[PDB]
Ligand binder design. Sequence first.
Ligand SMILES: Cc1n[nH]c2c1[C@](c1cc(N3CCCC3)cc(C(F)(F)F)c1)(C(C)C)C(C#N)=C(N)O2
Ligand SMILES: Cc1n[nH]c2c1[C@](c1cc(N3CCCC3)cc(C(F)(F)F)c1)(C(C)C)C(C#N)=C(N)O2
Lengths: 462, 462
Amino acid sequence: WTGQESLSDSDPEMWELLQREKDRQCRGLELIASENFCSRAALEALGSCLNNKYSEGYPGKRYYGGAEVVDEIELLCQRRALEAFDLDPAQWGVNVQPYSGSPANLAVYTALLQPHDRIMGLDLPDGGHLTHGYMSDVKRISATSIFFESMPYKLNPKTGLIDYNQLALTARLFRPRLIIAGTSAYARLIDYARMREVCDEVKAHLLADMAHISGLVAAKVIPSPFKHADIVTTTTHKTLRGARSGLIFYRKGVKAVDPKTGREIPYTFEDRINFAVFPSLQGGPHNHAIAAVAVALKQACTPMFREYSLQVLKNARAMADALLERGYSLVSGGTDNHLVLVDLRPKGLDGARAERVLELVSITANKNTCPGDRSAITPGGLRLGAPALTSRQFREDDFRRVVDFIDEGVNIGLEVKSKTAKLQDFKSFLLKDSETSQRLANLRQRVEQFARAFPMPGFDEH
Amino acid sequence: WTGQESLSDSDPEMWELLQREKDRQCRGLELIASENFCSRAALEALGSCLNNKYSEGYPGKRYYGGAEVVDEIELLCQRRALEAFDLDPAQWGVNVQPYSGSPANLAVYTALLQPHDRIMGLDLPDGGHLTHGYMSDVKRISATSIFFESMPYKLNPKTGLIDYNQLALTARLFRPRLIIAGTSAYARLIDYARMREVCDEVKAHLLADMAHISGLVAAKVIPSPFKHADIVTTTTHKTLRGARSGLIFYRKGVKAVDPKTGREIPYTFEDRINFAVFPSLQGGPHNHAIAAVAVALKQACTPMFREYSLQVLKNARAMADALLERGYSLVSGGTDNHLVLVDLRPKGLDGARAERVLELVSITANKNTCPGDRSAITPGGLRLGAPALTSRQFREDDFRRVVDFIDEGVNIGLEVKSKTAKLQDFKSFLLKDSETSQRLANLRQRVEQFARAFPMPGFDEH
Ligand SMILES: Cc1n[nH]c2c1[C@](c1cc(N3CCCC3)cc(C(F)(F)F)c1)(C(C)C)C(C#N)=C(N)O2
Ligand SMILES: Cc1n[nH]c2c1[C@](c1cc(N3CCCC3)cc(C(F)(F)F)c1)(C(C)C)C(C#N)=C(N)O2
């Protein structure tokens, strides 16, 4: 045994599963707004010998030696991260060690807040992320709500936007120490200037969690959260198109100067953010991930990536405009970003029904809660995203064509719904009924033929 | 841009960094007890298209669709995990999603304990891990000690062993809800049965954190903590020789049938452990890592891996014996596992000095506190481990040869100590002094010539 044998030779069972998954990704239409397709360059770094190195600590301040190269990789991943979002090294530092986006958020809270300190984030059904705080009536769901005290801020159910007025009303009562500006499922831009007004008034920190939009921010196709935010967290995946990992950007240097004291009052984020990641929360850095992130961060600095990002926005608008023109309602009436929230209630359907039908024809999207949701349990919408298929060289016409493929699925969903009682019965009907089955089997076959012809990033067979 | 370019062409700067690290690993003698060299098979899964899938939730209970293949991968990784450790699926379950070892531990505490509930782990300078609790005289350092209340237990400095008597004494007073059996720097086998008695007495959960020894446990070359623990956490790297990730094993089924009532009492770990990992702490699984772990767990079931693990013990013994023969002192007198704790104080040198000299001749080990010494004093010991070099096919003679090189390094360290006063003098004298610089260069070249000839697991170039 050398440990230099191929995966295909040494573990055929696993190799076939990778080939089955690679086939699935190629043949399908990926409309999940959080998914993308990572470059081969990044994945090569991700499966490198950098997996074999323990480098607890930070560049120049490690616990073990033999860390000369990984220091250069970490410092390069930092520099490239700052470059990718056009940040001055004197004003911003960055931590590249978080294992994902959820760890990066917990690290920020741990760094800046005492246990049980107060956090405000967009409510989960209103398009927020679990890690911004989430409790049900019976239990604390997110660990953010266990170790800290979270109160959600809501959407205006008329405009479908973030009610910035009610945020400011509740924030001055609840008195949070941190407010989170970021979203999982929201088609519009965030008023980071307004967020900072509220955070300034009530003496709170502003955290921008740009996970979903980080590529769009680097490409400068939408406005930057870095103009108004104290702290920015992100996934390195999603629109950035990197490996699964996380970043924490923080302000550094001088914040303010008081004329009375006659001196500079520095930002105190750096040491606390870094200490919270390590030694407080994480163990050994995943240097292979850090290197794969740095590969993607270089890619994001290029003209190529900007044109990809402009094409994401166009393809979202094209998917939005095409839905409107085929009789669909959109939450907030459209989009200014990579995704579209389709209210299926005004076309007499829900999200759960649409999801399972589309899935069966190799179209993967997720159900979504809309402001107009009459029922709290069964969600009445659909989140569709551009980034993935755009990375496969999809243009507007291709996106108009997937809308037509979707519409055919929705229209099967509307037909199966009217010949059905429950959501349990709705799934029994799709699998069993030959006329629905074969009409899906035909739609799948077309979707797969349409999808397969487009290029796929990464390796050829896995 | 296809995203199918090679890293070498795509990002030459990153490619040259990977190549330097590969050279450093190949030419070094890796004696860090936490290190290993991952198989190419495992690293191929790690840099696969599985990075592209979001599969929040668990197999058959996902939040998105299109997860049929990743479901099979996660279920396969679970089966192979239970098989590697010879566990009955009726009696044991396993979560394969933790992003690393430290996340796996935090998920356990989150799952079973309330904030501020009490944990006891082996003190950090006594050889426990940061995640078991650590506070300095003025600051909570580990997140375990921020969100929960940790009190350490200590070694008996006479024997270098865990003082099981004092643990039982202090546990009756402190009343921990959870006690952690597991170590980072400990040469001996833990008395899990005695840990169990103390836990049964004070009504505490026993957690076995077997990160360092997991491969030895899988190979059945040392006793298993699964015979006495409620929960077992581990890394998937270190002695298991996989990609960086974590596992949480837990009892399931019937705990004990109460004969007074008559009814069976169930274990209630499964749902709580799984909920803590997701949705409470983590987001999307790292399916690429999960698949790599599945490859490594498969490797760990084979005769090959048992022979590897026996060799790791023999090589550590051989290194211990070879150190004893050259007049070195070992903490606890020797070893029953993969590592050796050298006490350098008797020979008139410390761990900080030795570590840096050894680093400059391509031998990577780490300094370690000896029992009795306070943590504020410069550590007088050195931790050395067999697994990494054993994976490069080192045998007993080769480790004796390794001890020759270490001894030379120590002797160089002794000579530089007599010519300098402080640590910053010692460290700089190694770089600046001509005679010392030459002697190190000679030794380095001999170490590197020796190391390069042995095979290296992984890819050829990176
Ligand atoms: C898992 C998750 N993390 N962050 C999320 C989610 C979403 C989500 C959360 C949740 N919940 C988290 C715990 C229980 C509710 C449920 C659902 C679903 F699909 F069942 F409706 C969806 C979704 C992106 C998957 C979700 C929705 N809808 C939103 N808005 O943000
Ligand atoms: C980082 C870590 N996590 N878990 C550990 C450590 C060790 C460790 C912890 C620490 N500390 C963590 C916070 C400050 C002390 C310091 C040192 C050293 F090398 F500086 F002495 C070593 C070591 C394996 C690296 C360490 C030692 N010595 C032990 N016993 O276990």
